[PDB]
Amino acid sequence: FRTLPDGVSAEQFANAISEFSETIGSEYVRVDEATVSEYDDKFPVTDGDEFKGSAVIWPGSTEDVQVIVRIANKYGIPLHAFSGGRNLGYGGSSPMLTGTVLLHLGKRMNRVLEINEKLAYAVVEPGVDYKTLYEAVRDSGAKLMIDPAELDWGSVMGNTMEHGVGYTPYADHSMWRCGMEVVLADGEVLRTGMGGLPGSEAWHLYPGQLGPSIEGLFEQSNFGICTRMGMQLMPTPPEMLSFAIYFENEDDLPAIMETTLPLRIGMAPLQAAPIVRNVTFDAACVSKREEWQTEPGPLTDEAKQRMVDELGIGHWIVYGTCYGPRWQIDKYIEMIRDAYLQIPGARFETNETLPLREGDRASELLNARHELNTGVPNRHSAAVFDWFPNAGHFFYAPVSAPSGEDAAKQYEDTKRISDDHGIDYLAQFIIGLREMHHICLPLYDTADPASRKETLDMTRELIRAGAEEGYGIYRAHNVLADQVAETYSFNNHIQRRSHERIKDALDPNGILNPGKSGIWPERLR
Amino acid sequence: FRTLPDGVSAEQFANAISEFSETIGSEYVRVDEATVSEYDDKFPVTDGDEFKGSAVIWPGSTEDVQVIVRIANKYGIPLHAFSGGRNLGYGGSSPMLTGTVLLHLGKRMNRVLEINEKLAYAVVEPGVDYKTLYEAVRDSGAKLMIDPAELDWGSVMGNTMEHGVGYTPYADHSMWRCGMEVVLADGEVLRTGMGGLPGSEAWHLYPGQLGPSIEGLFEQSNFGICTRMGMQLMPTPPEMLSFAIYFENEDDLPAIMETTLPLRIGMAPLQAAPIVRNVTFDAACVSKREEWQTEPGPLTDEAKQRMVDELGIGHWIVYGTCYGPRWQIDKYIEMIRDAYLQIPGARFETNETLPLREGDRASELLNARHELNTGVPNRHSAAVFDWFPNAGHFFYAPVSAPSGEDAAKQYEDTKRISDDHGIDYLAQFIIGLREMHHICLPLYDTADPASRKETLDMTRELIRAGAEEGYGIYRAHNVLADQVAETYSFNNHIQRRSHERIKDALDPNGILNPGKSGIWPERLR
């Protein structure tokens, strides 16, 4: 066996594998290095046997998941369940504990169970990805839009369980999640909300029930295994028009963010949260690093200016979209253009004035956002993996109060700490409605131990620096779990203590991905 | 002592009362019948010592709440904590168990702590009611609106903890809740979300943290005591315009609901969920029953027609509001008017065509809704208490899929069952966004034991008949909790059993309001 979980002998593991095989089928229990290797983190920051699963199981049904969980309890074998296992930047499909048996639910449990046009929702199994839901809604003829993240291989269900986000009005995946089937750690099947009431047609309509709302308990946690999820879908509006706004100066960031906030907070004229990214982020989607700088140390200011000038973009680019009839779009576009063009040097384009054209890389950048913001998934951003050989990412994503001045300070400090470690800094700032996200997407060499260590060291420092300023991280790689968990220190970590009480109540044997979000079962504390 | 909790002797109770008095102050710990009886349910359906508390305490601070909870654990005395204690139709301020010590937080913990205009939120203590927050926002100059429920004495916090609702685009109070301070059942203080991170300014901006989202655990549950809550507030739009749509036929309800859904599901042109009430509900806001019918038996068709003709309304009235610049309002109003006026006999008005005029009861009814829908709280609907002497209510409010045909069947069935028990039926139907609510507001004589029994018997049959059709209740009176919890029967009540596991995790001594939402602590199961 490539790895074994602490406390479990080769003989005990082999007996568990025999029971998984007998009950699930031997074709669906994999121990071969060729298969299990594929579920190691694509973007590691560690060099050894950390985060390596022992085996992978491909369950075919909720019933298969139930029997696997019962066998895992009997043998004390930890499980890591995921939908797509493409959680790049946060661990991929890798488990918290070496030797964990992986459950890749999406391999076989991959159906769109229902599309309802009248009530604008879909019902998905784990393996439905953005591409597949887009195609299923297209083939249904329903006038509904999906809300994809940046990569079309992301799981509708998996991304939601991470509190992940896209870029339409429906960007908050956790908000439009409604009704879950969940296998609990003892093997019992739970249906949340109105799914608890036999015959209810409101399982995917109304996120409620008599008593507490518990769907949020299953986000970034190790309390159950989701087998089914409703996802409410935005009705397609009559028209959608996207825009790009290019800023000449690195120092324009404060004015960009202070301009954004009052246009967004009322949900109009910014009907969806726009993104604000630095030139390096857009450059990495359409070019390789060597086009700008042959020297391997930190990007110079002149290399960043080359990017701006040759691509025809800005040091900062705002992307957004307006939705509705043309009369409403035209009003909103004028308010947006008028506000941002107060910033000296700013330039405003739409997908009409900058249409997609072969070899016009600025047009391909806007086209990519226009697609995502109109519910058309793509994998345009996957080009960042080609920025240099083996380029991967490892997110630092703090949330803070909207503030131009504080965005510029986060930017300047992250630039300094990233340059200190020789790691390239792709930046995106977002005002969702009232909160400001700073997305630090570092590109490092995932094949190079020295690059891994610089990136891990850089990021632990960013977490410390962010925490000192009141900037908290709300999504984190496996290796960061304990450090980020420890920053929520109010009242001797009462949040983590509350998480542990719930963990021990719902998973008494501590079988589910121990240490997810710093939540360790009693047997490991 | 007027009542004692099962298992707690007078000597034990007196010892706990002496500790509450010593720590909180004797002037804030009340055991006299005159003071405690104030906290008995205003709208009982029981005749005895059911739901009668033993004592009331007025805590002055989070610290007072902590020390009361610690003492309660030492003595095994159940607590029921509430903000305003005006949960009329669901038990008022009454506890689940006879002899519960009541904590009326809002008596002394009653400050608005923040009105943030730039990031459009307020921070409230338990005792802040809609009237107070409205006045505090008005006097601050901040261009923000609140979202009141129907009665202005409702607690911003307390209503939220019941998954209560209002009528603006911010109607879903649970959605705009962000950041809670909670005293847990052991006395430990928890700050949810970014309040866990010292220094964070995002406690009331971003409903997230690393790990699970747990504010939903504190809705309709007995897991903690909230001492502070952020409430995000809609930015005030340039203009707002309300409308009333009158339908001449009782049988117009199916077309009304089927017209509403496609206008609401995309959040335009119905930007807030409109209400659809029957003539009796409107009549009861501007008149008394005897103005229409002297016979005490069920309201006749002729009495309802007298209401329609003399008030100048409809058997069904739709009330809604449009928000934004006038160019947008005028487009939406034209879409709404054009849609509903295809129903034969329908009549459309706005608060401009039917402005408030003395004697013009239709204009008073529209004005009352225009106020609620524009963030101006009132107590206009408090007139239903005067429909006849001692009139009160006892809600049956199931949720279902939007359907004209099913709405009309629910109406006809509820009219029949209410007629059979001699109970007046005030009806509202709402499509929220994708879900349909049926609000059955019965009016019964709260002082008359026969009327209490008819109301309870009627309601238990409504719950039974609703469940058989897949219509589930998501908010219920203390006396209905077990019956309603039992309708969520999927997988041998896995929902209830999961609530119970969380309950015993977070409240091992089972002190907090045992039985809330049918959630009983291990010591009483």
Ligand SMILES: *Cc1cc2c(cc1C)nc1c(=O)[nH]c(=O)nc-1n2C[C@H](O)[C@H](O)[C@H](O)COP(=O)(O)OP(=O)(O)OC[C@H]1O[C@@H](n2cnc3c(N)ncnc32)[C@H](O)[C@@H]1O
């Ligand atoms: C590299 C990258 C990543 C990225 C991105 C851009 C780039 C260049 N842009 C993103 C964005 O716009 N929005 C966003 O939310 N994420 C973005 N990412 C990160 C990543 O690509 C995506 O989030 C991706 O969609 C996540 O991976 P996936 O969808 O495959 O999800 P998963 O690995 O299956 O699940 C993640 C975790 O959730 C829990 N989980 C998931 N499914 C289950 C089930 N069924 N039961 C229980 N738990 C489940 C697990 O903890 C799992 O590890």
Ligand SMILES: *Cc1cc2c(cc1C)nc1c(=O)[nH]c(=O)nc-1n2C[C@H](O)[C@H](O)[C@H](O)COP(=O)(O)OP(=O)(O)OC[C@H]1O[C@@H](n2cnc3c(N)ncnc32)[C@H](O)[C@@H]1O
């Ligand atoms: C009679 C009536 C009722 C009504 C209504 C119209 C009429 C004519 N219209 C309503 C509406 O439009 N929307 C709505 O949500 N409710 C409406 N109602 C019912 C009722 O009037 C209101 O819901 C009212 O706002 C509720 O009472 P209040 O606001 O005073 O809340 P509370 O009694 O303090 O608390 C209710 C329960 O919540 C838990 N709770 C409350 N505060 C705490 C704290 N601090 N800690 C822990 N738990 C808390 C308790 O379970 C409490 O019993």
Ligand SMILES: [Cl-]
């Ligand atoms: Cl993605």
Ligand SMILES: [Cl-]
């Ligand atoms: Cl109310």
